[PDB]
Protein backbone atom coordinates (compact mmCIF):
# COMPACT_ATOMS: atom_id res chain seq x y z
CA UNK A 1 0.00 0.00 0.00
CA UNK A 2 2.82 2.41 0.85
CA UNK A 3 4.76 1.49 -2.24
CA UNK A 4 7.70 3.34 -3.99
CA UNK A 5 10.99 1.64 -3.00
CA UNK A 6 10.20 -2.01 -3.87
CA UNK A 7 10.15 -1.87 -7.68
CA UNK A 8 13.07 0.59 -7.93
CA UNK A 9 15.71 -1.93 -6.91
CA UNK A 10 15.14 -4.16 -9.92
CA UNK A 11 17.13 -1.84 -12.19
CA UNK A 12 20.09 -4.25 -12.49
CA UNK A 13 20.28 -4.99 -16.23
CA UNK A 14 16.60 -5.08 -17.07
CA UNK A 15 13.11 -4.18 -15.57
CA UNK A 16 11.82 -0.77 -14.15
CA UNK A 17 8.19 0.77 -14.15
CA UNK A 18 5.24 0.77 -11.66
CA UNK A 19 4.64 -1.16 -8.50
CA UNK A 20 1.58 -3.19 -9.19
CA UNK A 21 -0.51 -2.49 -6.14
CA UNK A 22 0.50 -3.98 -2.78
CA UNK A 23 2.71 -6.69 -4.26
CA UNK A 24 5.77 -5.61 -6.53
CA UNK A 25 9.09 -6.83 -8.17
CA UNK A 26 10.62 -7.16 -11.68
CA UNK A 27 8.81 -8.82 -14.66
CA UNK A 28 8.29 -6.38 -17.50
Curated annotation (Swiss-Prot):
A GO molecular function held by the record: toxin activity
Disulfide bonds: 3-19, 6-24, 10-26
A Gene Ontology cellular-component term: extracellular region
Keyword Disulfide bond: yes
Superkingdom classification of source: Eukaryota
Tissue expression profile of the protein: Expressed by the venom gland.
The entry's keywords: Calcium-activated potassium channel impairing toxin, Disulfide bond, Ion channel impairing toxin, Neurotoxin, Potassium channel impairing toxin, Secreted, Signal, Toxin
Localization per record: Secreted
Record comment regarding domains: Has the structural arrangement of an alpha-helix connected to a beta-sheet by disulfide bonds (CSalpha/beta).
Annotated function: Blocks small conductance calcium-activated potassium channels (KCNN, SK). Low toxicity by intracerebroventricular injection into mice.
Protein family according to the UniProt entry: Belongs to the short scorpion toxin superfamily. Potassium channel inhibitor family. Alpha-KTx 09 subfamily.
Descriptive protein name: Potassium channel toxin alpha-KTx 9.2
Organism: Olivierus martensii (Manchurian scorpion)
